[PDB]
UniProtKB/Swiss-Prot annotation, chain A:
<dbReference type="GO" id="GO:0006957">
    <property type="term" value="P:complement activation, alternative pathway"/>
</dbReference>
<dbReference type="GO" id="GO:0031640">
    <property type="term" value="P:killing of cells of another organism"/>
</dbReference>
<comment type="similarity">
    <text>Belongs to the calycin superfamily. Lipocalin family.</text>
</comment>
<keyword id="KW-0399">Innate immunity</keyword>
<dbReference type="GO" id="GO:0019841">
    <property type="term" value="F:retinol binding"/>
</dbReference>
<keyword id="KW-0732">Signal</keyword>
<dbReference type="GO" id="GO:0072562">
    <property type="term" value="C:blood microparticle"/>
</dbReference>
<keyword id="KW-0473">Membrane attack complex</keyword>
<keyword id="KW-1053">Target membrane</keyword>
Curated annotation (Swiss-Prot), chain B:
<protein>
    <recommendedName>
        <fullName>Complement component C8 alpha chain</fullName>
    </recommendedName>
</protein>
<comment type="function">
    <text>Component of the membrane attack complex (MAC), a multiprotein complex activated by the complement cascade, which inserts into a target cell membrane and forms a pore, leading to target cell membrane rupture and cell lysis. The MAC is initiated by proteolytic cleavage of C5 into complement C5b in response to the classical, alternative, lectin and GZMK complement pathways. The complement pathways consist in a cascade of proteins that leads to phagocytosis and breakdown of pathogens and signaling that strengthens the adaptive immune system.</text>
</comment>
<comment type="similarity">
    <text>Belongs to the complement C6/C7/C8/C9 family.</text>
</comment>
<comment type="subunit">
    <text>Heterotrimer of 3 chains: alpha (C8A), beta (C8B) and gamma (C8G); the alpha and gamma chains are disulfide bonded. Component of the membrane attack complex (MAC), composed of complement C5b, C6, C7, C8A, C8B, C8G and multiple copies of the pore-forming subunit C9.</text>
</comment>
Length: 168, 49
């Protein structure tokens, strides 16, 4: 657990747009307890000044849901604060690495509870990148046994008006 | 994780309420009635000598 350095000169306007979650690792029990059937997840990243509006598009029982969230700018480039709406706590999100047309490795912590995610722009992902992610997970001190790859297909976009959390 | 927050699963019932039965019902009723009538007459007499 540390504030590792973000992506060197992170650029929301390059990181903007579609990103595909490749895998997550965390202790968070629900990743394993009912960890089955984890739906494919895709992000649209939209610059909102220094912050970004991020919409996670996901299935839930085949109901396509979009979650509107602000990665609020901390003022450190590539470090963000997700405000808590009386949620369990704000999430500090460090974009630790990315190639804006290829991959991103996002570090997220709430209340000292940390998680790491691999996102990609493409269905195929260089095993090089994935291995690197694994490395940063070991450096994260998370076991490989906590890595949860997400199903390759069944992404959803443009959730219904009624299937939007509008969390902001 | 996408989940349902347990908060507000129950409410404390005030003493004066004997019951407060949560019970989701809906009933819809529609009626629609269209009555349109049109009548035309012509009557022509010529009488020439």
């Amino acid at each position: 657990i540390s504030t590792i350095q973000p992506k060197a000169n992170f650029d929301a306007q390059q990181f903007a747009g579609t990103w595909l979650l490749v895998a997550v690792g965390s202790a968070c029990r629900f990743l394993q307890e009912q960890g089955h059937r984890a739906e494919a997840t895709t992000l649209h990243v939209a610059p909102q000044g220094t912050a970004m509006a991020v919409s996670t598009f996901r299935k839930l029982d085949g109901i396509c849901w979009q979650v509107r969230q602000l990665y609020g700018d901390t003022g450190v480039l590539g470090r963000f604060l997700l405000q808590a709406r009386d949620a369990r706590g704000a999430v500090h999100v460090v974009v630790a690495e990315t190639d804006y047309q290829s991959f991103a490795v996002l570090y997220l912590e709430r209340a000292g509870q940390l998680s790491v995610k691999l996102y990609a722009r493409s269905l195929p992902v260089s095993d090089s990148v994935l291995s690197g992610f694994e490395q940063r997970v070991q450096e994260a001190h998370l076991t490989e046994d906590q890595i949860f790859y997400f199903p390759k297909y069944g992404f959803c976009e443009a959730a219904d008006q009624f299937h939007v959390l509008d969390e902001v | 994780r996408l989940y349902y927050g347990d908060d507000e699963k129950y409410f404390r019932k005030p003493y004066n309420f004997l019951k407060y039965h949560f019970e989701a019902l809906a009933d819809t009723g529609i009626s629609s009635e269209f009555y349109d009538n049109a009548n035309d007459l012509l009557s022509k007499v010529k009488k020439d000598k």
